[PDB]
Design a protein around this ligand. Structure first.
Ligand SMILES: [Mg+2]
Ligand SMILES: [Mg+2]
Ligand SMILES: [Mg+2]
Ligand SMILES: [Mg+2]
Ligand SMILES: [Mg+2]
Ligand SMILES: [Mg+2]
Ligand SMILES: [Mg+2]
Ligand SMILES: [Mg+2]
Ligand SMILES: [Zn+2]
Ligand SMILES: [Zn+2]
Lengths: 135, 114, 69, 98, 91
RNA sequence: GUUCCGAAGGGACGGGCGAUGGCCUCCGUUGCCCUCAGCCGAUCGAAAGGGAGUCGGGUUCAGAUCCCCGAAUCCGGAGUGGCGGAGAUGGGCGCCGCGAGGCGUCCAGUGCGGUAACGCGACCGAUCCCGGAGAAGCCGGCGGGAGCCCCGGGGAGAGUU
RNA sequence: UAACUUCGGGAUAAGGAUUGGCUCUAAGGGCUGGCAGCCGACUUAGAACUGGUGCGGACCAGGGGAAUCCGACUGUUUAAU
């Protein structure tokens, strides 16, 4: 039962973003010419929003509920699949595989992930996806 | 041959009194007093026997002069625990929490049944 | 001691305020310009004689130049 | 049923297809070609929990062999140690139909 | 080739300390210098570090055991009896 | 007697109050209150243990890693930080502009690269917790790097003839 | 190369032969492109000749065997009988 499909929450087990949560936006089950191994384009979050409680000002809540995101290619060996699923409509034409040869495109893709991560987090679902892992 | 002497008032072959030979621009052979060989940090996991990588191996009080990038690596637990045990810790925490959720839901199901 | 491989950055170093003097060494196959700053001695090494002399004129006027042999 | 599962494994590895080892059984599970996974009783608890989680994700059966990796390997008929193995094609054996 | 008839590891003691003492120390010497198989990884990498302490070269796992053997019959019978006692206690 | 029968602390981020100086800005000195706070016991004990950081040439009658010259380096300090660089300077929409480019609204911005081990010159963060280095026996064998010795020739000067 | 033996020793047991100088021979390896070229470093074995039988020529350098008594052994002890 092939389960590594877009919308599948994963944990990054290696690299700079180790222990960070991410959601798959594209999977390549058979490696291309440049990457012989199977891999996946993923977009995750770097800095989780801080714990927000009542009795705080609206400015403080809005300032502490900010997300910084990342986008990267990973190995299935370096990814750990969970059982949760997050269905956030990332735009494919901006979040895609040719983005890594231009920093401006990379920044646009990161911003595009960030804005809708903010939107869903403020809606308040996928709280497991948005609260950090305690390891 | 030219056989030479110490340069300090310590005349015993102790740990601090270690020297090497060097030929000076005056065409002479002298002792220089070397520094004690430092060690890279050992992993905080307490299991891996090897040293950490990407961290300079110097005598501990020299680490004040180094910059931060030459002291750690860009990762969670960077420069304090090795990558293998980092990834096993991540996996262990996640799977343990999943098992805890499973046992909680089974307990709730049993409470409903009873 | 530091070795400067470029020319205009060496010129900047010469115009620095801590520069006390510049000394010119003329040895076979080579020309060396040594600026004495506060912390380091900066050496610019060049192998062309007319480049060396035009740099010598291009050196700042208010800094003590001393050729040595 | 240890004798009968030894017989089935001998037949499976005579005829069908299999992979021996954790880092390759994981690849087979992720590709979904793994029909059955078998784990020795002395494999590390962390990785056996990992394999169980992967099998639950991929809807695959897991069997806890009743011997450690040395005689799991000898039951495989290999002269080394295997902790986890994956049957990909049962072949002419009723290992899946236990 | 076979270099000795009776004495094995105790060939290093020469003609000293007596035949009976050498014989009764030979088996303990063999037992304490043997390599045992690890019950945790299956490799034969169990060495006695110090008296009562056994170490695996691959697992990096340390076990408390006998002075000259990896485990003693007293230890194994105590373990079995304690298991049976717990089984009876919880019925 | 040395933690044993002690009310064994005179410290601190921050918050509040009260005064002061300095362009009363903002901070500092403080004075009071709130809040936080285990130490294993004062103190002594190594010119061979632990312990950051200096080397080369010259110089006397007798002193040199100490004097002179030349190259360095560590620690501490610095209101105004003395300067520079990083943070950090972007995107959308709407106008004007043939365009280049510029004006208005919004919104983001506690850094990036690599599959990875890791890398880049920086790259916020307190009480608290965790770990490492300091920090180690004796013997054997092997390998690498030096210094000395050895060998084959070029010079310069001396001996024999 | 013996008695004996705690089978480890005894053991260099005991007892014999050889050893100089010179001229040769054979074997023992690298690098480059079953072959070829270019480089080597020390050793071992054998042979001919030769000296007033002399050769580990100075220095260095275990006498041995057969038994008895005592203490198993290594170790320590009355600085000045
Ligand atoms: Mg000392
Ligand atoms: Mg580093
Ligand atoms: Mg003291
Ligand atoms: Mg001292
Ligand atoms: Mg005798
Ligand atoms: Mg008698
Ligand atoms: Mg005696
Ligand atoms: Mg006496
Ligand atoms: Zn480790
Ligand atoms: Zn083991």
């Amino acid at each position: 039962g092939k389960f590594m499909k877009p919308g599948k929450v994963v944990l990054v087990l290696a690299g700079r973003y180790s222990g960070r949560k991410a959601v798959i936006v594209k999977n390549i089950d058979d490696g291309t010419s440049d990457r012989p191994y199977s891999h996946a384009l993923v977009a995750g979050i770097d800095r989780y929003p801080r714990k927000v409680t009542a009795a705080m000002g609206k400015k403080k809540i809005a300032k502490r509920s900010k997300i910084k995101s990342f986008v990267k290619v990973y190995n299935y060996n370096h990814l750990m699949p969970t059982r949760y699923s997050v269905d956030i409509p990332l735009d494919k034409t901006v979040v895609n595989k040719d983005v890594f040869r231009d920093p401006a495109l990379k920044r646009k893709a990161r911003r595009e992930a960030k804005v809708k991560f903010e939107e869903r987090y403020k809606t308040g679902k996928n709280k497991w996806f948005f609260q950090k892992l305690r390891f | 041959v030219q056989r030479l002497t110490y340069r300090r008032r310590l005349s015993y072959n102790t740990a601090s009194n270690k020297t090497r030979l060097s030929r000076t621009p005056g065409n002479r052979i002298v002792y220089l007093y070397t520094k004690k060989v430092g060690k890279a940090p050992k992993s905080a996991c307490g299991v891996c026997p090897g040293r950490l990588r990407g961290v300079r191996a110097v005598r501990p009080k020299v680490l004040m002069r180094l910059s931060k990038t030459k002291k750690h690596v860009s990762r969670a637990y960077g420069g304090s625990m090795c990558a293998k045990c980092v990834r096993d810790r991540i996996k262990r925490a996640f799977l343990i929490e999943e098992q805890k959720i499973v046992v909680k839901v089974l307990k709730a199901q049993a409470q409903s049944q009873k | 001691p530091r070795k400067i491989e470029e020319i205009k950055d060496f010129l900047l170093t010469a115009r620095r305020k801590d520069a006390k003097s510049v000394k010119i060494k003329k040895n076979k196959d080579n020309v060396k310009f040594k600026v004495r700053c506060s912390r380091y001695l900066y050496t610019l090494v060049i192998t062309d004689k007319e480049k060396a002399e035009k740099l010598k004129q291009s050196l700042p006027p208010g800094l003590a130049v001393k050729e040595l042999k | 049923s240890l004798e009968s599962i030894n017989s089935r494994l001998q037949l499976v590895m005579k005829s069908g297809k299999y992979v021996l080892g954790y880092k390759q059984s994981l690849k087979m599970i992720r590709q979904g070609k793994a029909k059955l996974v078998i784990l020795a009783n002395n494999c590390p608890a962390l990785r056996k929990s990992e394999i169980e989680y992967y099998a639950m994700l991929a809807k695959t059966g897991v069997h806890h062999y009743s011997g450690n990796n040395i005689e799991l390997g000898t039951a495989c008929g290999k002269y080394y140690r295997v902790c986890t193995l994956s049957i990909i094609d049962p072949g002419d054996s009723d290992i899946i139909r236990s | 080739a076979k270099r000795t008839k009776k004495v094995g590891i105790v060939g290093k003691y020469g003609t000293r300390y007596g035949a009976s003492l050498r014989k009764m120390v030979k088996k303990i010497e063999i037992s304490q210098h043997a390599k045992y198989t690890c019950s945790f990884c299956g490799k034969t990498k169990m060495k006695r570090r110090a008296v009562g302490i056994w170490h695996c070269g691959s697992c990096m796992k340390t076990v408390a055991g006998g002075a000259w053997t990896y485990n003693t019959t007293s230890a194994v019978t105590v373990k079995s009896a304690i298991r049976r006692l717990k089984e009876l206690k919880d019925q």
